[PDB]
C-alpha cells in the first residue's frame, strides 16, 4: 500500500495524514465527531507495511521526490527509508521481519529506537527544531546516505521525518503544532516536552482510550485529558489492543468520574505508612 | 465476625493517629498505621472491604479487614 | 469544627517536615507525617477533603481530615 | 518452592499484623511489613505474582514473592 | 524563593543517600525520605512541582516543594 | 559502571528483605529500603530505570538508580 504525505501547504499535509488514517484505522464508537476521531489501527498481519512518498518539500514542485518511508502498519513504526533513485531500502536492525519487494535491502546495524537515534544524532527530541528548511536538509542527508550504519546527519534526518509523519499520524497535537512550519511565514516548530511525553505514552494511551465512555477526564501517567475536545485535539490513531500491556490485566479504574490507567493509580497507592517508611532506614 | 461488607463511604484520619472508615452505614476505626494507605487505596479503587472484629458495634475498633476488587 | 471542604488546590512539603494543603481557598498545615502521601493521593484523584480543627483560620494547623469520593 | 502463580484473588490484613493473599486458590500469609502495599497494588492491577515458600498448602507462610508482567 | 517550576524530568537515588530531581533543566537534591514517594508520584503522574529554598541555585539541597496537578 | 538501562521485567522481594529487579536480562538486588515502592512503581508504569553499580554481573547489588520518563 502506497500513500503520499505532501508538505506543500498545511492543507495538503493535513489532507495527506487524514487519508492515511482513514485507510488504516477505524474510529472508536465513543470518541468520534464528524470525521475527526480517535481511530484504532485495523488488524493486519505482522510484517505488513505501507509506503509513504515524501512530496512538496519545495512547495508544489516535483523536486526532492526520491524519499520513501517504510512504515510497519500495526504499530506505525518507521522500519527504514527508501532512496527511490538508487532503489535501495535502508532498514533498521529491529525490522528484519519487514520485507520490501523489488528493492535492494541494506540491513543496518543501527536500531530505530529514540534512545539510539538521539545518541547517534547528538540531538535531543525535547527542544528539537523542525522547519521546511531542515526537512529539505534532512531529505538531502538521507539521499546522500550510504552504508549499513547510520551517521549523525542521517539520524537527525530520521528523527525529524519520524516526528512529522508517524508521530503526527498518531497525534493530532503534533500535526497541529508542526503544520504551522509549512506556512508562508516559515516559522520553526519546536518539539515540546509535552509532545515528547505523548510519543512515549502511545501504548499506554492506546490501552485506555477504548474504555472511555464519556468520563469527566482521562489520566494515563503524565498525560491528562479534561474533556472530549482535549482527547480529539491530541490523539488521532491508537494501537489495536484487542505494547498495550505493561503489567497486570486491568486497563482502567474509574475514580471520581475520571478514567485512570490502573497502573498509574497502583503506582501511587503502593506506599506504606509514611512514618514507618522514613524511620525504617 | 464480619462487621460490615461493602464499599468505603468515607475515610478519616483522626487527631489520635487512628483511622476511621464508614462501611455499609457503620463507622469503624483502626489504630494500625499500615491500614491507612491500604484503606484509602480500597476507597479510591472501589474495592469491597470486609471489616472483621470480635465486636461489631458502630464506633468500634478493628485490626482485620479483607480486600476484594469485586 | 469543619474548617474547609473541597478539593485540594495545591499541597506543599515544608522545611520543618510539616505539610500544607489549600482547600476552599484556605491553607492548612499538618505535622502528621502519615497524612503526606494520603493527602497527595487525595489531591491526585480529586477527592473532596474536609479539614477539621478547633482553629479554622487560614494558615492554621490540623490533624483531622475526612476523605470523600464524588 | 514456587507454590502458587497467578493473580491475587483477595488480600487480608490480619490482627497479628501479618498479611494474607489468596493465589491459585490457596491462602498464604506474610509477616514482611513492606509486602502489604506492594501486594495490594499488585492485586488492584491484576499483576501475576509467584508465592515462594517451604510449604505450599493453603495456610502456609511466605517471605518471598515475585511480581511478574504476565 | 521559587527555584524551579515544572514537571519532573527524571529522579535518581544516589549511593550517598541523596535523591535528585531534574525540574526545568536544573538538578536539585533532597535527603528527606518523606519526599521520595511524593516526588516520584509527582513524576509519574505529571504534577507540576515548585522547588523552593531560601537560596536558589543549581545542584543544591531542598526541603520545600509545592505540588500542583496543573 | 553503567550496568543496565531498561524496563523492569520482574521484581522480587527476597527472604533476606532485599529487593531484586530484572533489567536488560540481568538480576540486581538492593537492600535500600526506600527503593522498594519506587522500583515497583517503575515496574507498574514501565519506566526505564538505569542501574549503576561497581559490578554489573547478574546477581550484583546496587544502591544507585535513575528513574526516567523515556
Ligand atoms: C488550639 O490548638 C489548635 O488545635 C488544632 C486542632 O484542634 C490544631 O492542632 C492539631 O494540628 C497540629 C498540626 O498538625 C498538631 O498535630 C496538633 O497536635 C493537633 N492537635 C490535636 C489536639 O490533635 C492547631 O495546630 C492548634 O493550634
Ligand atoms: C511558626 O510558623 C507557623 O509554621 C507552621 C508550620 O510549622 C505553618 O506554616 C506552614 O503552613 C503555612 C500554611 O499557610 C504555609 O504553607 C507555610 O509556608 C508553612 N511553613 C513553612 C515553614 O513552610 C504556620 O502557618 C505558621 O504560622
XYZ file of C-alpha atoms and ligand atoms in Angstrom:
685
model
C 0.000 0.000 0.000
C 1.377 3.401 -1.048
C 0.493 6.854 0.310
C 1.821 10.365 -0.223
C 2.489 12.902 2.504
C 2.563 16.282 0.746
C 4.329 19.040 2.693
C 3.356 21.809 0.230
C 0.793 23.513 2.470
C -0.983 22.938 5.777
C -3.990 21.835 3.718
C -2.022 19.285 1.670
C -0.228 17.962 4.765
C -3.338 17.503 6.931
C -5.254 16.053 3.964
C -2.411 13.546 3.449
C -2.444 12.453 7.084
C -6.241 12.165 7.188
C -6.225 9.982 4.050
C -3.738 7.552 5.610
C -5.717 7.413 8.856
C -8.996 6.616 7.066
C -7.395 3.719 5.171
C -5.500 2.031 8.023
C -7.789 2.627 11.021
C -11.397 2.626 12.259
C -12.950 5.304 14.531
C -13.774 4.453 18.139
C -17.521 4.410 18.745
C -17.208 6.751 21.739
C -14.505 9.215 20.606
C -15.637 10.469 17.220
C -17.138 13.730 15.961
C -17.907 14.160 12.262
C -14.938 12.544 10.509
C -12.471 13.558 13.239
C -11.876 10.701 15.655
C -9.554 8.621 17.735
C -9.208 5.575 15.478
C -7.853 2.088 16.139
C -5.379 0.603 13.629
C -7.125 -2.184 11.690
C -5.705 -5.629 12.351
C -3.026 -6.589 9.824
C -0.504 -9.456 9.926
C 2.928 -8.793 11.463
C 5.325 -7.736 8.697
C 2.658 -5.710 6.900
C 3.849 -2.245 5.939
C 2.773 0.769 3.954
C 4.987 3.113 1.953
C 4.942 6.891 2.332
C 6.225 9.005 -0.531
C 7.524 12.349 0.709
C 6.416 15.237 -1.513
C 6.125 19.029 -1.510
C 9.267 19.808 0.490
C 9.656 22.533 -2.114
C 6.049 23.798 -2.236
C 4.088 22.285 -5.160
C 7.305 21.338 -7.007
C 8.282 17.943 -8.404
C 11.670 18.296 -6.691
C 13.178 16.411 -3.742
C 10.951 13.462 -4.654
C 13.164 10.385 -4.157
C 12.452 9.650 -0.487
C 10.051 6.952 0.658
C 9.488 5.863 4.263
C 8.579 2.275 5.105
C 6.107 2.152 7.982
C 5.106 -1.067 9.742
C 1.327 -0.907 9.688
C 0.358 -2.493 13.022
C 2.421 -0.101 15.134
C 3.227 2.811 12.802
C 6.953 2.309 13.455
C 9.316 3.556 10.761
C 11.156 0.423 9.591
C 13.519 2.421 7.394
C 13.733 4.549 4.269
C 13.985 4.006 0.518
C 16.101 6.016 -1.883
C 13.928 5.523 -4.970
C 16.675 6.846 -7.260
C 19.091 4.069 -6.229
C 16.236 1.619 -5.461
C 17.695 0.925 -2.013
C 15.842 0.214 1.232
C 17.845 1.109 4.339
C 16.277 -0.999 7.053
C 16.718 -0.649 10.819
C 18.159 -3.626 12.706
C 14.936 -4.194 14.656
C 12.891 -4.624 11.458
C 14.422 -7.671 9.751
C 10.846 -9.038 9.613
C 9.834 -6.257 7.190
C 10.405 -7.365 3.598
C 10.035 -4.943 0.690
C 9.901 -6.481 -2.818
C 11.803 -5.124 -5.842
C 14.405 -3.121 -3.897
C 17.966 -3.724 -2.737
C 17.688 -4.166 1.035
C 20.533 -2.870 3.180
C 20.222 -4.309 6.677
C 21.556 -1.724 9.107
C 23.480 -2.208 12.355
C 21.566 0.731 13.846
C 18.227 0.146 15.577
C 15.253 2.507 15.280
C 14.813 3.420 18.969
C 14.772 7.057 20.047
C 17.473 6.203 22.599
C 19.772 5.087 19.764
C 18.799 7.777 17.257
C 19.219 10.656 19.728
C 22.677 9.330 20.653
C 23.922 8.924 17.051
C 22.289 12.217 16.022
C 23.682 14.113 19.036
C 20.217 15.680 19.101
C 17.581 15.518 21.822
C 13.934 15.470 20.723
C 12.878 17.765 23.570
C 13.566 21.181 22.040
C 14.274 19.764 18.572
C 13.554 22.314 15.848
C 11.843 21.327 12.594
C 11.312 23.710 9.685
C 10.727 23.372 5.953
C 14.420 24.239 5.562
C 15.548 21.487 7.962
C 13.281 18.925 6.254
C 14.960 19.758 2.923
C 18.333 19.336 4.666
C 17.043 16.069 6.167
C 15.985 14.842 2.719
C 19.406 15.627 1.233
C 21.157 13.842 4.106
C 19.084 10.701 3.536
C 19.707 10.788 -0.215
C 23.472 11.126 0.341
C 23.443 8.313 2.914
C 25.064 5.008 2.029
C 26.185 2.033 4.114
C 24.897 -0.231 6.878
C 25.454 2.134 9.838
C 23.555 5.377 10.493
C 25.569 8.608 10.514
C 24.870 11.682 12.655
C 23.168 13.590 9.825
C 21.111 10.600 8.667
C 19.932 10.078 12.257
C 18.971 13.748 12.609
C 17.042 13.362 9.350
C 15.164 10.286 10.605
C 14.294 11.990 13.921
C 12.754 14.904 12.020
C 10.880 12.775 9.479
C 9.501 10.260 12.013
C 8.150 13.169 14.078
C 6.267 14.791 11.195
C 4.985 11.531 9.680
C 4.467 8.614 12.088
C 4.125 10.681 15.284
C 1.838 13.209 13.569
C -0.297 10.332 12.283
C -0.698 9.145 15.879
C -1.119 12.559 17.495
C -3.294 15.365 16.186
C -1.424 17.596 18.679
C 1.840 17.137 16.758
C 0.031 17.521 13.426
C -1.416 20.845 14.644
C 1.788 22.224 16.124
C 4.090 21.180 13.300
C 1.842 22.263 10.416
C 2.454 25.941 11.211
C 6.035 25.450 9.940
C 4.587 24.806 6.461
C 3.004 28.262 6.166
C 4.409 31.099 4.031
C 5.860 32.761 7.157
C 8.038 29.624 7.531
C 8.252 29.600 11.336
C 10.116 26.939 13.294
C 8.321 24.061 15.002
C 9.944 23.293 18.356
C 9.119 19.921 19.850
C 7.910 20.450 23.423
C 8.418 18.226 26.472
C 4.634 17.612 26.211
C 4.952 16.448 22.588
C 7.746 14.091 23.629
C 5.684 12.748 26.564
C 2.811 11.892 24.223
C 5.048 9.833 21.949
C 6.471 7.965 24.962
C 2.976 7.054 26.203
C 1.308 5.941 22.982
C 0.941 2.278 24.004
C -0.470 3.213 27.401
C -2.920 5.714 25.891
C -3.935 3.017 23.382
C -4.888 0.609 26.171
C -7.037 3.163 27.985
C -8.991 5.148 25.364
C -11.126 2.201 24.119
C -12.604 2.053 27.646
C -13.706 5.715 27.586
C -17.469 6.191 27.970
C -17.745 9.969 28.419
C -15.957 10.327 31.771
C -15.092 13.845 33.005
C -11.416 13.095 32.372
C -8.712 10.624 31.374
C -5.421 10.129 33.215
C -2.596 7.995 31.840
C 0.653 8.516 33.730
C 1.827 12.059 32.961
C -0.931 12.590 30.372
C -4.242 14.249 31.234
C -7.345 14.873 29.106
C -10.056 17.006 30.728
C -12.794 16.615 28.091
C -13.569 15.121 24.676
C -12.129 18.087 22.716
C -8.849 17.638 24.617
C -8.807 13.961 23.593
C -9.605 14.722 19.938
C -7.211 17.688 19.800
C -4.398 15.434 20.983
C -4.814 11.843 19.738
C -5.743 10.623 16.246
C -4.662 6.964 15.984
C -4.077 4.271 18.624
C -2.748 0.703 18.681
C -5.163 -2.188 18.425
C -5.169 -3.548 21.988
C -7.982 -6.024 21.268
C 2.999 -2.718 23.765
C -0.564 -2.191 25.052
C 0.131 -4.078 28.250
C 2.974 -3.346 30.658
C 1.941 -5.481 33.622
C -1.328 -6.745 35.109
C -4.602 -7.190 33.231
C -6.795 -4.229 34.198
C -6.762 -1.389 31.663
C -8.632 1.187 33.760
C -10.181 2.270 37.053
C -12.923 4.903 37.239
C -12.122 7.237 40.153
C -14.285 10.318 40.802
C -15.606 10.364 37.212
C -12.075 10.220 35.796
C -10.796 7.254 33.805
C -7.379 6.270 35.193
C -4.868 3.847 33.765
C -4.941 1.268 36.580
C -1.121 1.043 36.612
C -0.797 4.773 37.302
C -3.168 4.588 40.282
C -1.378 1.460 41.543
C 1.983 3.276 41.337
C 0.985 5.954 43.856
C -1.165 3.651 46.022
C 1.676 1.229 46.838
C 3.242 3.303 49.627
C 3.267 2.133 53.243
C 2.709 4.370 56.282
C 4.888 7.455 55.814
C 6.260 7.494 59.371
C 7.233 3.833 59.023
C 8.816 4.412 55.612
C 11.077 7.264 56.690
C 12.113 5.833 60.070
C 12.873 2.387 58.581
C 16.235 3.184 57.000
C -17.346 -11.836 62.965
C -17.969 -9.942 59.714
C -18.901 -6.470 60.992
C -19.531 -4.798 57.649
C -19.089 -5.612 53.979
C -19.209 -3.034 51.204
C -17.509 -0.024 49.693
C -15.857 2.611 51.859
C -18.268 5.564 52.073
C -15.679 7.850 53.670
C -12.355 7.627 55.486
C -10.945 9.929 58.152
C -7.546 10.487 59.734
C -8.068 11.249 63.425
C -6.266 13.522 65.904
C -5.148 10.471 67.922
C -3.497 8.997 64.774
C -6.226 6.388 64.347
C -8.152 5.990 61.089
C -11.909 5.762 60.587
C -13.857 4.172 57.730
C -17.596 4.045 57.088
C -18.753 0.780 55.508
C -22.385 -0.220 54.880
C -23.635 2.665 57.041
C -21.481 1.907 60.094
C -18.273 3.571 61.299
C -15.192 1.688 62.488
C -11.694 2.782 63.477
C -8.249 1.193 63.487
C -5.001 2.114 65.224
C -2.851 0.068 62.806
C -0.954 2.640 60.712
C -0.338 0.432 57.668
C -4.117 0.095 57.280
C -4.323 3.813 56.464
C -2.889 3.573 52.917
C -4.493 0.128 52.423
C -7.942 1.514 53.286
C -7.521 4.720 51.271
C -6.471 2.656 48.243
C -9.532 0.414 48.683
C -11.741 3.511 48.910
C -10.261 5.079 45.772
C -10.336 1.958 43.585
C -13.809 0.819 44.695
C -12.777 -2.354 46.496
C -15.308 -4.250 48.571
C -13.945 -4.392 52.123
C -14.994 -6.790 54.874
C -14.332 -5.387 58.354
C -13.753 -8.212 60.833
C -13.683 -7.991 64.629
C -14.767 -9.582 67.911
C -17.097 -6.617 68.500
C -19.016 -5.138 65.570
C -20.906 -2.220 67.192
C -20.720 1.068 65.272
C -17.779 3.129 66.529
C -15.762 0.029 67.479
C -12.138 -0.842 66.680
C -10.831 -3.388 64.179
C -7.493 -4.786 63.026
C -8.695 -7.368 60.489
C -10.027 -6.484 57.036
C -10.429 -8.337 53.745
C -9.986 -6.552 50.393
C -11.721 -7.658 47.170
C -11.656 -5.983 43.754
C -15.242 -7.237 43.371
C -15.348 22.011 63.554
C -15.375 21.714 59.749
C -12.863 24.339 58.611
C -12.870 23.778 54.865
C -14.458 21.315 52.476
C -13.417 20.811 48.860
C -10.689 19.542 46.566
C -7.023 20.106 47.348
C -5.886 23.093 45.256
C -2.194 22.549 45.982
C -0.071 20.703 48.525
C 3.350 21.651 49.861
C 6.092 19.849 51.735
C 7.682 22.252 54.224
C 11.266 22.547 55.506
C 10.194 21.623 59.057
C 8.674 18.374 57.668
C 5.124 19.677 58.018
C 2.723 19.520 55.081
C 0.396 22.219 53.759
C -2.792 21.887 51.711
C -5.039 24.570 50.227
C -8.728 23.695 50.491
C -11.620 26.048 49.606
C -9.200 28.980 49.237
C -7.679 28.458 52.690
C -4.315 26.995 53.710
C -3.837 24.436 56.484
C -0.791 22.522 57.672
C -0.229 19.239 59.479
C 2.712 17.815 61.408
C 1.420 14.253 60.980
C 3.776 12.553 58.514
C 1.256 9.791 57.747
C -1.030 12.368 56.160
C 1.508 13.366 53.475
C 1.010 10.567 50.902
C -2.686 10.246 51.832
C -3.246 13.922 51.033
C -1.213 13.545 47.836
C -3.417 10.620 46.738
C -6.498 12.697 47.591
C -5.144 15.640 45.540
C -4.224 13.484 42.532
C -7.652 11.821 42.399
C -9.789 14.877 43.202
C -11.200 13.612 46.495
C -13.311 16.049 48.478
C -11.488 16.616 51.757
C -12.927 18.093 54.947
C -10.341 19.747 57.195
C -11.391 19.520 60.848
C -9.810 21.644 63.580
C -10.565 23.884 66.573
C -8.924 26.766 64.672
C -10.175 27.350 61.127
C -8.198 30.489 60.243
C -6.195 30.136 57.021
C -2.628 29.218 57.981
C -3.679 27.114 60.993
C -2.818 23.508 61.873
C -4.910 20.339 61.662
C -4.643 16.631 62.461
C -8.152 15.511 61.489
C -9.286 15.193 57.880
C -12.113 13.346 56.159
C -11.747 11.920 52.646
C -14.767 11.567 50.357
C -15.219 10.425 46.778
C -17.767 12.066 44.453
C 9.443 -23.930 46.146
C 7.296 -21.923 43.739
C 3.961 -22.585 45.457
C 1.388 -20.565 43.566
C 1.438 -18.368 40.497
C -1.455 -16.163 39.455
C -3.456 -13.077 40.286
C -4.353 -12.200 43.870
C -7.974 -13.275 44.444
C -8.308 -11.425 47.758
C -5.994 -9.896 50.351
C -6.458 -9.565 54.100
C -4.820 -7.612 56.894
C -4.675 -9.830 59.982
C -4.947 -8.986 63.679
C -1.353 -10.109 64.315
C -0.267 -7.585 61.620
C 0.542 -10.294 59.097
C -0.990 -10.062 55.634
C -2.744 -12.777 53.643
C -3.185 -13.210 49.886
C -5.137 -15.873 48.006
C -3.276 -17.051 44.902
C -4.228 -20.033 42.707
C -6.980 -20.937 45.191
C -4.623 -21.134 48.186
C -4.137 -18.700 51.073
C -0.677 -17.528 52.135
C 0.367 -15.153 54.895
C 3.460 -12.985 55.319
C 4.884 -11.068 58.273
C 7.023 -8.906 55.969
C 5.615 -5.411 56.555
C 6.815 -3.983 53.237
C 4.859 -6.561 51.249
C 1.478 -5.195 52.361
C 1.136 -2.210 49.998
C 3.166 -3.952 47.272
C 0.770 -6.890 47.278
C -2.344 -4.692 47.392
C -1.145 -2.711 44.370
C -0.431 -5.978 42.540
C -3.978 -7.035 43.473
C -5.705 -3.898 42.209
C -3.975 -4.005 38.777
C -4.236 -7.794 38.305
C -0.484 -8.348 38.400
C 0.568 -12.010 38.367
C 2.564 -12.973 41.475
C 4.567 -16.092 42.334
C 4.448 -17.073 46.022
C 7.603 -18.885 47.157
C 7.726 -20.940 50.358
C 8.948 -24.111 52.083
C 5.375 -25.460 52.079
C 2.651 -24.820 49.524
C -0.516 -25.889 51.358
C -3.160 -23.221 51.883
C -2.348 -21.563 55.225
C 1.420 -21.538 54.608
C 3.705 -18.594 55.345
C 5.931 -16.824 52.847
C 8.742 -14.274 52.889
C 9.497 -14.316 49.155
C 7.316 -13.239 46.237
C 7.965 -12.427 42.593
C 5.954 -9.746 40.789
C 5.550 -10.724 37.128
C 4.474 -8.882 33.975
C 2.310 -11.761 32.634
C 12.028 31.705 46.811
C 10.951 29.663 43.779
C 13.982 27.845 42.344
C 12.326 25.807 39.604
C 8.824 25.057 38.362
C 7.703 22.276 36.033
C 7.237 18.537 35.651
C 9.975 16.208 36.903
C 12.261 15.173 34.016
C 13.947 12.368 35.965
C 14.558 11.287 39.542
C 17.568 9.416 40.893
C 18.601 7.851 44.167
C 22.356 8.037 44.754
C 24.692 5.746 46.730
C 25.317 8.629 49.159
C 21.612 8.654 50.205
C 20.575 11.743 48.226
C 17.533 11.912 45.942
C 17.953 14.064 42.814
C 15.159 15.520 40.690
C 15.504 17.476 37.465
C 12.995 20.315 37.147
C 13.072 22.976 34.399
C 16.542 21.866 33.247
C 18.067 22.136 36.730
C 19.058 19.399 39.179
C 18.203 19.601 42.883
C 18.533 17.029 45.643
C 16.927 16.120 48.965
C 17.833 13.603 51.656
C 14.332 13.721 53.154
C 12.953 10.203 52.638
C 9.458 11.673 53.099
C 9.973 13.419 49.763
C 10.948 10.307 47.784
C 7.473 8.777 47.319
C 5.938 12.259 46.990
C 8.394 13.313 44.289
C 8.228 10.014 42.400
C 4.412 10.074 42.471
C 4.593 13.646 41.142
C 6.967 12.455 38.404
C 4.829 9.515 37.267
C 1.526 11.472 37.334
C 2.940 14.593 35.640
C 2.364 17.008 38.518
C 3.836 20.479 38.313
C 6.352 20.840 41.133
C 7.788 24.073 42.503
C 11.156 23.648 44.218
C 11.536 26.242 46.972
C 14.549 27.332 49.031
C 15.880 30.388 50.882
C 18.715 30.409 48.340
C 18.077 29.029 44.845
C 20.968 27.512 42.898
C 21.983 24.536 40.747
C 22.741 21.230 42.490
C 21.593 22.485 45.891
C 19.621 20.761 48.640
C 15.919 21.435 49.141
C 13.193 20.552 51.645
C 10.313 22.725 50.415
C 8.286 21.770 47.348
C 4.796 22.616 46.136
C 2.737 20.082 44.175
C 0.026 21.006 41.649
C -1.999 18.789 39.312
C -1.690 21.596 36.699
C 29.728 1.268 35.947
C 26.591 1.554 33.801
C 25.025 -1.846 34.436
C 21.583 -1.785 32.895
C 19.099 0.603 31.358
C 15.654 -0.718 30.552
C 12.246 -1.630 31.901
C 11.791 -3.890 34.913
C 10.950 -7.385 33.620
C 10.106 -8.661 37.090
C 10.688 -7.708 40.701
C 11.124 -9.930 43.738
C 11.022 -9.497 47.494
C 13.759 -11.740 48.915
C 13.897 -13.786 52.145
C 16.703 -11.518 53.431
C 14.402 -8.476 52.884
C 16.405 -7.219 49.906
C 14.595 -6.433 46.665
C 15.525 -7.719 43.207
C 14.757 -6.332 39.760
C 15.468 -7.878 36.370
C 16.636 -5.246 33.879
C 18.153 -5.951 30.438
C 18.215 -9.696 31.146
C 20.199 -9.418 34.385
C 19.093 -9.549 38.033
C 20.160 -6.888 40.530
C 19.351 -6.666 44.236
C 19.197 -3.738 46.637
C 18.970 -3.578 50.416
C 17.978 0.117 50.287
C 14.564 0.120 51.955
C 13.481 3.400 50.334
C 13.728 1.866 46.859
C 11.117 -0.878 47.229
C 7.923 1.103 46.455
C 9.860 3.230 43.955
C 11.026 0.199 41.980
C 7.540 -1.334 41.976
C 6.082 1.984 40.763
C 8.679 1.954 37.959
C 7.711 -1.601 37.003
C 3.993 -0.745 37.092
C 4.342 2.244 34.754
C 7.045 0.768 32.513
C 9.638 3.373 33.483
C 13.115 2.996 32.048
C 15.451 2.510 35.002
C 19.211 2.973 34.928
C 21.059 0.732 37.389
C 24.608 1.765 38.270
C 26.946 -0.336 40.429
C 30.606 -1.264 40.802
C 29.899 -4.737 39.309
C 27.371 -5.487 36.563
C 27.194 -9.295 36.519
C 23.736 -10.708 37.171
C 23.422 -11.132 40.948
C 25.214 -7.844 41.694
C 23.907 -5.411 44.303
C 23.112 -1.747 43.720
C 22.203 1.384 45.651
C 22.064 3.862 42.743
C 19.142 4.004 40.295
C 17.714 6.612 37.933
C 14.012 6.739 37.037
C 13.412 8.006 33.503
C 10.229 9.015 31.645
C 11.580 7.713 28.320
C -5.774 25.273 69.847
O -4.866 24.278 69.370
C -5.043 24.014 67.979
O -5.652 22.727 67.818
C -5.883 22.385 66.447
C -6.738 21.122 66.347
O -7.984 21.307 67.024
C -4.536 22.241 65.728
O -3.731 21.227 66.339
C -3.701 19.964 65.651
O -2.851 20.008 64.490
C -1.463 20.262 64.765
C -0.690 20.350 63.453
O -0.797 19.115 62.739
C -0.888 19.214 65.731
O -0.817 17.922 65.113
C -1.750 19.110 66.988
O -1.265 18.041 67.803
C -3.213 18.872 66.607
N -3.999 18.990 67.832
C -4.608 17.931 68.370
C -5.327 18.094 69.508
O -4.541 16.815 67.876
C -3.793 23.575 65.818
O -2.479 23.466 65.250
C -3.688 24.064 67.266
O -3.188 25.406 67.272
C 5.511 29.208 63.269
O 5.004 29.462 61.958
C 4.000 28.518 61.581
O 4.612 27.390 60.938
C 3.655 26.385 60.587
C 4.361 25.094 60.189
O 5.142 24.650 61.301
C 2.730 26.938 59.500
O 3.441 27.313 58.313
C 3.313 26.378 57.226
O 1.973 26.350 56.701
C 1.557 27.549 56.035
C 0.084 27.431 55.655
O -0.427 28.730 55.335
C 2.474 27.832 54.841
O 2.371 26.783 53.869
C 3.922 27.941 55.318
O 4.791 28.112 54.192
C 4.323 26.693 56.114
N 5.578 26.983 56.799
C 6.771 26.680 56.285
C 7.875 26.979 57.007
O 6.904 26.154 55.191
C 2.002 28.158 60.068
O 1.179 28.764 59.061
C 2.988 29.183 60.641
O 2.270 30.200 61.350
